[PDB]
Amino acid sequence: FHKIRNEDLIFNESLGQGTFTKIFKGVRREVGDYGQLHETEVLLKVLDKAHRNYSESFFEAASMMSKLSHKHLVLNYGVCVCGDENILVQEFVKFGSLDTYLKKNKNCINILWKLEVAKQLAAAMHFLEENTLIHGNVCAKNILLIREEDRKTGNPPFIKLSDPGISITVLPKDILQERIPWVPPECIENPKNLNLATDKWSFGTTLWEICSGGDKPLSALDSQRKLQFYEDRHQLPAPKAAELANLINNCMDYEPDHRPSFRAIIRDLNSL
Numbered sequence: 001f002h003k004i005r006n007e008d009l010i011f012n013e014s015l016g017q018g019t020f021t022k023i024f025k026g027v028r029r030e031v032g033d034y035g036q037l038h039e040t041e042v043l044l045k046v047l048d049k050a051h052r053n054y055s056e057s058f059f060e061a062a063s064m065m066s067k068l069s070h071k072h073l074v075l076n077y078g079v080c081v082c083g084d085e086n087i088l089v090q091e092f093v094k095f096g097s098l099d100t101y102l103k104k105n106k107n108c109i110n111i112l113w114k115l116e117v118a119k120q121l122a123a124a125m126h127f128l129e130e131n132t133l134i135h136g137n138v139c140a141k142n143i144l145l146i147r148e149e150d151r152k153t154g155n156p157p158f159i160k161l162s163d164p165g166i167s168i169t170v171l172p173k174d175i176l177q178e179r180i181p182w183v184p185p186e187c188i189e190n191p192k193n194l195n196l197a198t199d200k201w202s203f204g205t206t207l208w209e210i211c212s213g214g215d216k217p218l219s220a221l222d223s224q225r226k227l228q229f230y231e232d233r234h235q236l237p238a239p240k241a242a243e244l245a246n247l248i249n250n251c252m253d254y255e256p257d258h259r260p261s262f263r264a265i266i267r268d269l270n271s272l
């Protein structure tokens with residue numbers, strides 16, 4: 001990671017919190033191309049001091065996203081580890097997390113918009129699968145909207161996938177259960193089962209979110225009931241807009257070996 005000075009970072013408004021983290025919009029003062037000085041908008045992710053013992057995993061997650069370069073992956077700019085802080089410095093995506101956007105703009109998102117976003121997410125995941133690189137936390141809140149759809153110019157929306165955060169392989173069990181049905185059944189049974197097939201399952205859950213206007217599946221179930229949901233081998237209900245329900249259920253296969261490749265997922269999406 002590139003090291004960024006604390007004095008070059010300005011923390012501004014809170015964007016909420018993640019698991020053991022707080023997130024802010026900020027500004028990074030930097031020398032850019034041609035030596036020009038810039039004050040660049042950045043996403044600042046801060047590991048809670050009380051959870052400093054996760055620092056390794058915290059940075060490993062981000063390092064995953066910098067292992068490769070791709071148009072659908074959020075950029076890491078660097079880290080600030082001055083003093084008692086563990087800070088990730090990332091690209092700031094103008095329109096933010098997709099679940100919030102879906103909840104706010106549900107009354108004007110149609111099947112074509114959803115198909116474009118689904119195809120872009122699948123393209124990103126196909127890139128990761130070809131590189132045998134596990135993401136491990138695919139979900140709508142980790143999809144960021146770079147550009148809105150502009151039908152006046154035919155321009156489709158454009159999204160990127162953000163870093164997965166601290167890995168489910170080290171998180172407490174109660175958090176994993178709260179993350180049902182994004183965390184697949186085999187990872188509830190054993191978080192060390194994290195594998196490429198994990199991201200196919202979570203991709204299914206994320207499509208469900210995209211089709212459900214930002215609703216969270218199984219939100220009315222407490223952790224014990226989410227566990228039993230897996231134990232009874234239930235599937236998610238079809239969204240009212242049911243165009244992707246079969247793909248959702250095919251990806252959310254309780255047999256990890258049977259989940260379709262992302263190449264096959266993309267072929268399916270292109271057939272609609």
Ligand SMILES: O=C(Nc1nc2cccc(-c3ccc(CN4CCS(=O)(=O)CC4)cc3)n2n1)C1CC1
Pocket residue numbers: 015016017018023043074090091092093094095096097100141142144162
């Ligand atoms: O937020 C914006 N851009 C932006 N860029 C990036 C780049 C990387 C990561 C993020 C990001 C920020 C926050 C979150 C969690 N978060 C908590 C409250 S929640 O309501 O559940 C919606 C999601 C998740 C991802 N972001 N976010 C624009 C709208 C102001």
